[PDB]
Amino acid sequence: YGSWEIDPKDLTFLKELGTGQFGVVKYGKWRGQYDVAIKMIKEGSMSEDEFIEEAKVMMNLSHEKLVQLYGVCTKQRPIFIITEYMANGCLLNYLREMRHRFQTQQLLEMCKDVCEAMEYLESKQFLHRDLAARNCLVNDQGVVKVSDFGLSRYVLDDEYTSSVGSKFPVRWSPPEVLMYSKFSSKSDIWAFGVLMWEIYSLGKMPYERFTNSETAEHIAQGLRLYRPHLASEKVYTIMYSCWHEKADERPTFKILLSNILDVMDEES
Numbered sequence: 021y022g023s024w025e026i027d028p029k030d031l032t033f034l035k036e037l038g039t040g041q042f043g044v045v046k047y048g049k050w051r052g053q054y055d056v057a058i059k060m061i062k063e064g065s066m067s068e069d070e071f072i073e074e075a076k077v078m079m080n081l082s083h084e085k086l087v088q089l090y091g092v093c094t095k096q097r098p099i100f101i102i103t104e105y106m107a108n109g110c111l112l113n114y115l116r117e118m119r120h121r122f123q124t125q126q127l128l129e130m131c132k133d134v135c136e137a138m139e140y141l142e143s144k145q146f147l148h149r150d151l152a153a154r155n156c157l158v159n160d161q162g163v164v165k166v167s168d169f170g171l172s173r174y175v176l177d178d179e180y181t182s183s184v185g186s187k188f189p190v191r192w193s194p195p196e197v198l199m200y201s202k203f204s205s206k207s208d209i210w211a212f213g214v215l216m217w218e219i220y221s222l223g224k225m226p227y228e229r230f231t232n233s234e235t236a237e238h239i240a241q242g243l244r245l246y247r248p249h250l251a252s253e254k255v256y257t258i259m260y261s262c263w264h265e266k267a268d269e270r271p272t273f274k275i276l277l278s279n280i281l282d283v284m285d286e287e288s
């Protein structure tokens with residue numbers, strides 16, 4: 021039909037995985053052989069014309085630390101987005117689960133995994149726009165991968181897209197996004213910094229004592245996240261470097277990967 025198009029007849033819905041961001045998610049089999057997860061893009065939530073075209077570029081993205089996109093179902097409604105099944109679910113839950121007693125080595129490995137994915141997205145000039153622990157997925161092997169990337173681009177409800185919106189990710193946003201709606205590679209850098217904080221805080225909510233509007237106010241005025249207990253000074257420096265007020269002074273994802281690998285070597 022199209023190169024990435026999947027025939028819905030090749031799919032079979034088996035289990036409920038819950039409601040995800042921008043759609044219902046189900047576990048199933050593709051061609052009765054491969055384990056897949058299917059996100060059904062809620063009808064009318066997206067600007068379908070633009071969304072279908074941008075999905076083609078999205079599908080061409082290929083990386084080990086990006087959630088593997090098998091195909092799409094764009095000829096019917098709701099639109100399906102078919103991906104690999106990530107058995108350990110969302111990273112936020114994986115972090116919060118108290119039966120998991122993490123070592124900092126494992127927490128730094130999670131940061132590397134995402135930083136590799138984000139370095140790749142940066143090399144393709146493809147912005148995530150909503151990087152967080154709730155968005156990241158974990159497979160059966162404990163490898164973290166990035167997911168829902170670029171998916172906020174064409175959400176029709178202004179409460180999700182507007183910097184002053186009620187469902188906007190204020191706590192993962194830099195001052196230039198909150199004040200001026202200015203997204204770039206450096207807004208992804210800021211968010212990754214907050215994600216590092218989330219990881220090292222074992223899934224704690226950033227700026228938890230403040231509401232979203234209170235947080236928005238305090239970020240613009242110079243508030244930055246404190247050092248988590250599990251974060252060493254060197255790890256804190258890395259996540260803190262992501263939060264320069266001036267966007268151009270923030271590092272690239274290449275530089276952040278180099279910083280993480282340096283710490284990894286000394287950490288051993």
Ligand SMILES: */C(=C(/C#N)C(=O)N1CCC[C@@H](n2nc(-c3ccc(Oc4ccccc4)cc3F)c3c(N)ncnc32)C1)C(C)(C)N1CCN(C2COC2)CC1
Nearest residue numbers: 038039040045057058059105106109110112113154168169
């Ligand atoms: C996280 C959940 C928990 N516990 C959690 O695990 N998940 C929420 C339910 C759906 C789960 N899930 N989603 C996918 C999946 C993601 C993305 C896509 O499509 C795209 C689109 C663009 C680029 C890449 C991928 C398809 C999918 F199928 C899963 C996969 N692949 N495997 C396994 N599980 C998947 C994720 C938390 C943070 C606790 N949770 C709380 C409730 N939240 C809803 C309330 O508002 C949202 C969801 C987030």
